[PDB]
Design a protein around this ligand. Structure first.
Ligand SMILES: [Cl-]
Ligand SMILES: [Cl-]
Ligand SMILES: [Cl-]
Ligand SMILES: [Cl-]
Lengths: 295, 296, 299, 299
């Protein structure tokens, strides 16, 4: 799955004032990401507010993104739901729309065993019908640090093409790379991107790529050139942003920056997310202006 | 909300081998719980496998349980989703079908503030159109211990009529009762029911009540009569069963017991839940036979 | 386990009074032992966490053990908490407990460094050997130790030869019941004072607690009320205990207790050792009012 | 922070050799000090967790401090970990560190009892006063201590008067970067050896680690490779360190390290103190083979 290697934005879902999909802003956001030189888009993930959308709504996003982006950048459909059948429906739809890959978060909420996770992934792969699968290692959600044997099991499942390493454990990052030298291994926490690459990730998937994807592409290139100072500098700038976004609320802060970038019409998330606290708007607008100047 | 007090079974949702809703087994389960002398049913909760069902399916179940049980026992609809809008849709449906109350788990997965949980409950309460609301204190999911002040804010939200205390912290159970003398306070962990009552809970909502609700009613009665020994003995028997169900998988183990009690046609949970390991079937069948004899 | 039957009951986890220079206040320590004997406490648990053992040297701990033995041997049951991280240090305290005439030893699961479960077992075996006949109380406090024993592991620990009891300092009352179910004759001490009534109901047959220093009689009252089937009295007593515990959590538990004991004319100077700070002066009125209230309910 | 810049670098967290009877092996201690110096290490961190401080008496820890200072003062930097639960005990060790001529002191956040943040700050202030001019290395540590500091709390700790450095025993490299961003001149030691390269990239300017005892030159290699922009050499070296760390985690880290040193003819007897058990015999060939491989990397 070498063709899945790279820096992929986890696409946000713009909503209108009534919390319905803002189709026009979705299309603007897809093109905005393409123009940033991003390798691909990760669509319908946690970042896309998948877990406050219906299946129909998730499919509509997939279809529109494919319309805008197919044959220009890589497209990975996050089809994960708690339910295997629901996840399967989305995988089949991803295949129809011509996505390059599917992905599923570890089924959550209820206590599922590792065996049940594996069967879940097998069924989704079947429904994906030739599309490779990106599986997760996400301890914050699962409540489990899986062993290296379990990871081997996961990443050697027939059809699995990559691992989204959504963990800040860079010893485990290095251990996974050592065990699987050819594995596509996405760094999941944007705020350790540079260090995650050094530890052995060969790319990433992240929410903040939407507004500053060129910075992350800059880190990749700097590290390839042995330019440690440039890499560090860029990560420091990314982290200044992540500091602010955690204060504001990450998705809504991102949408607001995009609103000031003239991409997103209405920067709301779906309830129960509240609006951005108005005291942060000047910082978010200033950030949008700073980012716009970096282009 | 005092009429919401008591022992409420968290109803399981029967499915068939296609993973479709088994409507005949659902009606049978509802009647079986009524015949156990249960005070009510808590429908479409986590226990009811809500989070692997669509809104429509949850509505179908709510409507059918209301058909079978409205007027005979108390009915609480769990309408909780991550999405407020979705929760409001189910709240409005619960009202239409004639439920006595609604309930919603803390919105999960994403990081939401306590203020955002409160606005979420307010929106659901509005859509429930006069039905009282049961809120949760569920640290295992929320990943936080709520201050007494936060609980105090929660239970005094307008329209909130009970707290589902899904915590094994019996110091906090007492603190809550001490602060809110008239609060309807449901013990959430079946395996500490007797001790939870002793600490201040005045009832419970439980998945295991589906197969042995009379034992939990028996603990209420024994504690009211000052019969500590019978209370302890019954809790011990419930915990022998809980030990087994934790090994088998709780929901599928319960459905399997009900299958052996001739209530549920097919004891499956929805994928990604797998089947019960067949080595446990003799124990589960033997347990069904023991429970049937207790009635007898 | 049946041979350990005489260890069943309500045991105060003794505090260690210090003077203004943070040295042992022997006169106050002797006072506190006698105060606890006069409350009709079944026994004393000496040199535990409550005693500030982990800010004491070995010699200081032996000194406390020897003094308490001088005051109380033969009058009430005495359990010596001998636990340190080091097994050799623990053994030295265990031998001393035997020399001074203690009825039992106890050890917290060795902490800080991750030790294997087999290493915990050998630690307990070594201490049991040095205790030379005195039975062992296994002391379980996941919240402070950071040691997370499984039920299987607990079952193995409590059946080690020479083990006569379990100090269960856990709020998990499902586990409490599971332990009782597996070991019908085991002496099973409830460790969190704020759930005492519920813990007894779940299957503890007594408790070891720091708050017993100032209101042991309330906890004995709960044991009696449950045994008689008087659930109302049991609940009411537990509620009063929890009102006190609410205050103590605000003030800091050890120092709040010593302050109450100061106002009861037991403890001269209610200091804990650094880095414990002093009680906030705004809480003194509440602490004095509690001392007065508690002195009243004895008649 | 700028005036304690000379503590920047790669500092081995010194192990404490014990003899067959588990008493201090002074001879082997002197030999381990010289072994570390000959590796080109910048300094030693003495009497930390790694040095088995928490299974030693105060006198034993002082004896170790005196011996190391004898062997190494003036040749490399020396940091005395003086941390105990007790402030007065930490102050004794701090006064001794000053007497033996150490360059800095350090103290783990006091553990077991749940101290407030203000209490932690006063504990450090008191130790800083007793160290009488030696700068303090503070801790940010949860996995071992159990103490869970916020970033704002870390920022207050590291700016206390007399604090010259932070030992960041955390795998959180976002926080590592945040700390560097807030404090440009702070000496910031990477605490987890297994992420050393990544930790330097995030902002650490050196480290303190147990595995430096057997392969310190590899970590100095990483520093140098990263300074020269040779990312592949850095990754390669970190990968080799991690293969060793994988084995040490299987064997038990301190005892595994001691066994490697025994095979390198640095340490006479590779025992840790009870309740640490011995290395399982089945790992000995791997440990001997590791010793030979490391001896070859410099011979
Ligand atoms: Cl995502
Ligand atoms: Cl439920
Ligand atoms: Cl104690
Ligand atoms: Cl150390």
């Amino acid at each position: 799955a070498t063709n899945l290697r790279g820096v992929m934005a986890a696409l946000l879902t713009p909503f209108d004032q009534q919390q319905a999909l803002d189709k026009a802003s979705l299309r603007r956001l897809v093109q905005f990401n393409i123009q940033q030189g991003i390798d691909g888009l990760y669509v319908g993930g946690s970042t896309g507010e998948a877990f406050v959308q219906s299946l129909s709504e998730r499919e509509q996003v997939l279809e529109i993104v494919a319309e805008e982006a197919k044959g220009k950048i890589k497209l990975i459909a996050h089809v994960g739901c708690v339910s295997t059948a629901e996840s399967q429906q989305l995988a089949a739809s991803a295949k129809r729309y011509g996505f390059d890959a599917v992905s599923a978060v570890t089924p959550f909420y209820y206590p599922f065993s590792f065996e049940e996770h594996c069967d879940h992934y097998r069924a989704i792969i079947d429904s994906a019908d030739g599309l490779p699968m990106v599986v997760y290692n996400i301890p914050a959600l699962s409540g489990v640090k899986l062993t290296l044997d379990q990871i081997n099991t996961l990443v050697t499942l027939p059809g699995v093409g990559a691992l989204k390493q959504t963990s800040g454990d860079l010893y485990q990052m290095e251990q996974i790379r050592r065990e699987h030298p050819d594995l596509v291994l996405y760094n999941g926490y944007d705020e350790i991107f540079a260090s995650g690459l050094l530890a052995g990730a060969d790319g990433g998937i992240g929410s903040t790529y939407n507004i500053m994807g060129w910075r992350y592409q800059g880190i990749v290139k700097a590290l390839k050139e042995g330019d440690i100072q440039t890499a560090q500098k860029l990560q420091t700038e990314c982290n200044k942003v992540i500091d602010l976004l955690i204060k504001t609320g990450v998705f809504r802060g991102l949408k607001t920056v995009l609103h000031y970038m003239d991409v997103v019409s209405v920067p709301l998330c779906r309830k129960p997310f509240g609006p951005v606290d108005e005291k942060y708007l000047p910082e978010l607008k200033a950030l949008a202006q700073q980012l716009m100047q970096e282009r």
